[PDB]
């Protein structure tokens, strides 16, 4: 039996009384079921006769509105007090825990029948129920603050208000919700024929249903595990120099015993060529120019060069295989247009809130006297137009709108997009001139805790959601905050996203035409308030083509010195001048011809090779000239033979040595063109063919016109073993004495023992910020970005077509929370989020599959399907005769299983954010999931957008890649797929530019090793016999490039593809200093090997040393007027540490080994 019923007259305003009626319960109306099912679901079962009507519940839901405004966070905490009020409104047990003390009469103006108001009663309640409620609801965090939600509802300090006094305060009429006081009796036992309410409860740790998730420990920190820390650092410093400083000690012992050991076919085939070349040098010169000019006229047909940024991965590589999934499926990745704002002039600020005292410091840049000027600049940038094809272009035609056909507010991720980018909304001062209750400070403080919630709970009714319909995040907007709270902000971030659409080409430069005006405006700007830095994602590329056009003058003068040196260095007033200039025209045309061939073939000429190859072909091609003509000058003419037979003899002498040096490295490059890195793949083709066609040109063109020079010097008019043989005959023998031969082997094995030591500390990855001019705005940006932001580039985890999404497991593989499996996708993203320094992934996954379930949840009151045609009624329409989507049934409260799931899905995808509902799907998930029509319906690819931490250096990017791929493959195998039909590969903007660095250490051990293996093989073909003649070459070519790895560390040079092409250069140029001494050693008619080497030194070695000084003096001219930094950091020190380290181990070290293990016939 119940105590009262109905609604008696007014106490004051809207607050009414109840009417006394101590009889049987009343069968509820049919239309009242929709309220009682939502409010008191623990009563609607079996018989429906309770002691309430619809009007009590109608006013009662209005009475407890503010508890729903505060206690919407944890549903279980609200559920406990909801159980209390249900029992107070219409329990059938009201005769058991209620005793009415005061009763008043009442007169009705309408019906005139004398009724009875309910004045005052006693509520017998369980004490343990209050304790359970308090223990479950003590730690509920209030919105826009770090205090308790009870504090606003206790009417006092939150820490001192107990369960008991708070329930008294809730029952009190002073607060302004309850009509009159309800006197409680806090007991746990039957006292004098009463049965107090001890109805069952559930604490905030425990859920009431499956769909109701356990209240996450931001508001109930009773039972959640601590922030875990499984970074185990592995152990370095094991093999430092234990096998370096104690391996050379055996060298200083084996080489020390020698200190104590004292105690006792082709000439016939080149002479015959050289004969014909000298007999008729009229036609053979004509057959050179025609063949060149024919093969060097195809360049003008193509001459194409590739300068996008993505030229650093092969189009069949895995990176671009992943990237080219985004042309058909869900479009491109959007560019950014970042613009960082900060103010050093403005000082700190302190805010003091009104009702409670919890002062909060605001940083410099977010004060109103700055924010007006920030908004001025903000609105000024959207008033920027450019011209394409002589038509105007504005921002709205290029920037994306996440929901486009409804409205076309362009997207801006400014902080002022919390304030909807307006002036009048800023200064909503609520209150009198004396004090202010609510301002932009508290609104800003509320709008950072929940960026999706439209209607703010403050005095204001300002939407927090962005102007473009999408939630502006606190991640992408603020900078230099102390990692949790955003009130200490010191840098504003402005972002203008814009489309790409790769399959189109006519509307990309359309956008770049705007972006140049964007830069042109932001550069030409003056402001004493604040300092700015900016970045367009075209401007990462523009600075390369700006900076690269600043070292044309430095280097043409570098080649001029090499052009002048060839004149001076031939002879001993009748020196060889003209043929030096002719010899330049050979190599300068040879390299042009080699580019002209492959131009017609169709391979694009990169910016790497264009300056690297004219060093190579010159530095190799001229060393043919310096050896040949000096070998001619060191020969004397015989008694009975003319110049023809002389040149044939000396050609047959020298040329078979030279043929090896040409044909070895040439073939070494074309058998080192099998790597797939497209900077080194495109180099070796040119590097091989240029020197190939060069060597085929000196044998044709150069030697034929030497006779003309001898004819010219026979006439003794213009257009003797004296120069170095005096020097080398004095310099040579002191090396090969017993006095110095242990020293120069001990030092130059010591440097190998030094170079083998620090190979562990070989530096990997190019630094991004060491490729810019120092005076640029970009270097200022790369200083800023590493200093302020906490959320770098986004990453997408794309799951391909093939997965179910209908059956339970279909959900459970991608499911997240609400009583679900702990090995799912978004769960594993969420587990890796806290371990940001371990695995470089910043923050929450923010998926659609969980939000969709909240949208299709029966208590949403969001979606309404039409009664007759199944058309989607809008959430903000009057709703006259269209019905709920999911029938409000306990079996129906679960997530959908059949095709109704995918039947309801497109209506979610076509929903704008309405105030009565949540955000919907079409705001931020319109491009998220692909729909496919056929076999009913089907769903395509899904991606879960999350953000990486701030990344600054080369180590960070590759560290992010490895662990992103680890996470993907970890969940792939755990997900339990049949075959390799679909993966969960990650994607970002930069996973093409840093895939090659993942496998740089593998392919170089292939590439240089195979090139080195080519030097082993072809010399066996060229030298015929003598294995030990080729092994000693292979050893010295190995030992020079390990010292090249040594000098990488010694200066601090990275191991990028830009350095790898100039590293494989060493394999091609070091053989030049090795063959011309080895052939000279293997054929020499002396018995004893000691004096045999001096022949090889004095006859060939001097002319080799004469051919290093041009590149030696071509080095000094680079640094003497060095302008750029990228050219100075790789392409200076590599050449210097290649010439001065190759020539050292070539013509000083090697003869000493030839005096030790010198073979003979
Ligand atoms: C976040 C990732 C981000 C996207 N990212 N990461 C790495 N990179 C990147 C991309 C490309 C590059 N490159 C690599 C090669 N760079 C380079 C550096 C020096 C370098 O020598 C300077 C050369 C040359 O020609 C000239 C001038 N010229 C004249 N006509 C055409 N050009 C030149 C000079 C002498 C002679 Cl005889 C002939 C020439 Cl053609 O000056 C030539 C090229 C040029 C720049 C770099 Br470094 C980094 C990025 O963009
Ligand atoms: C970063 O933001 C936090 C937000 O809490 C700042 O902490 C607050 O610092 C200011 C200055 O002290 C105050 O608002 C407040 O400190 C006050 O707390 C005591 C409590 O009894 C009070 O008596 C004093 O008036 C004192 O000023 C801090 N707030 C809290 C909740 O602790 C923090 O200082 C900011 N960081 C920096 C570097 O400024
Ligand atoms: C985004 O679009 C909404 C409308 O869908 C804009 O709201 C109104 O815009 C008009 C100007 O078109 C202005 O009077 C106000 O800004 C809004 N009206 C009212 C009554 O307040 C909104 O301005 C758009 N956002 C931006 C940044 O332009
Ligand atoms: C900026 O807006 C003002 C007012 O609408 C207008 O006079 C001016 O022409 C605009 N600027 C440009 C570059 O179009
Ligand atoms: C360019 O556009 C302007 C105005 O839109 C017009 O007057 C002019 O004739 C155009 N010029 C050309 C070459 O199309
Ligand atoms: C926000 O909620 C309050 C609660 O009373 C209401 O007055 C106001 O109209 C709501 N705002 C909007 C924009 O509907
Ligand atoms: C910012 O500069 C403007 C220039 O008109 C000036 O009016 C304003 O006082 C400056 N701000 C501050 C905080 O001094
Ligand atoms: C997931 O939960 C089950 C049941 O509690 C447990 O056996 C399993 O170890 C959990 N998974 C992981 C990865 O710990
Ligand atoms: C992890 O990195 C963050 C940078 O966002 C830093 O604040 C924090 O100190 C790091 N964690 C540890 C344990 O050092
Ligand atoms: C809601 O639906 C009605 C149906 O006529 C439509 O007029 C209105 O534009 C819709 N609102 C939104 C925000 O899509
Ligand atoms: C919905 O349709 C059914 C049958 O088509 C009908 O009985 C019912 O009255 C309709 N509901 C409304 C609100 O018109």
Residue numbers in the entry: 24 to 287, 334 to 641, 650 to 796, 814 to 1255
Publication excerpt:
Two lysosomal proteins, NPC1 and NPC2, collaborate to export cholesterol from the lysosomal membrane. Human NPC1 has 1278 amino-acid residues, including an N-terminal lumenal domain (NTD), a middle lumenal domain (MLD), a C-terminal lumenal domain (CTD), and 13 TMs. Then, NPC1 employs its NTD and MLD to bind NPC2 and transfer its cholesterol.
To enhance the signal of itraconazole in the density map, we synthesized Br-labeled itraconazole (I-Br) which contains four cis-stereoisomers. The structure was then determined at 4.0-Å resolution from ~210 k particles. The isomers are indistinguishable at this resolution and they have similar interactions with the binding pocket; therefore, we built a model using the Br-labeled cis-2R,4 S,2′S isomer as a representative of the Br-labeled itraconazole mixture. The I-Br binds to a hydrophobic cavity that is generated by the SSD, the MLD and the CTD in the center of NPC1. Residues in the N-terminal loop and C-terminal helices of the MLD and the CTD, as well as TMs 3, 4, 5, and 13 contribute to the cavity that accommodates I-Br. The terminal sec-butyl moiety of I-Br inserts into the cavity and is contacted by residues W381, I609, L613, I685, F1087, I1220, and Y1225. Superimposing the cryo-EM structure of I-Br-bound NPC1 to the crystal structure of NPC1-ΔNTD reveals subtle differences between the TMs and no noticeable conformation changes between lumenal domains. Calculations using the program MOLE confirm a ~120-Å long tunnel in NPC1 with a minimum diameter of 7 Å, extending from the bottom of the MLD and CTD to the SSD. Our structural analysis reveals that P691 is located at the exit of the putative transport tunnel. Itraconazole may prevent this transport through blocking the tunnel directly.
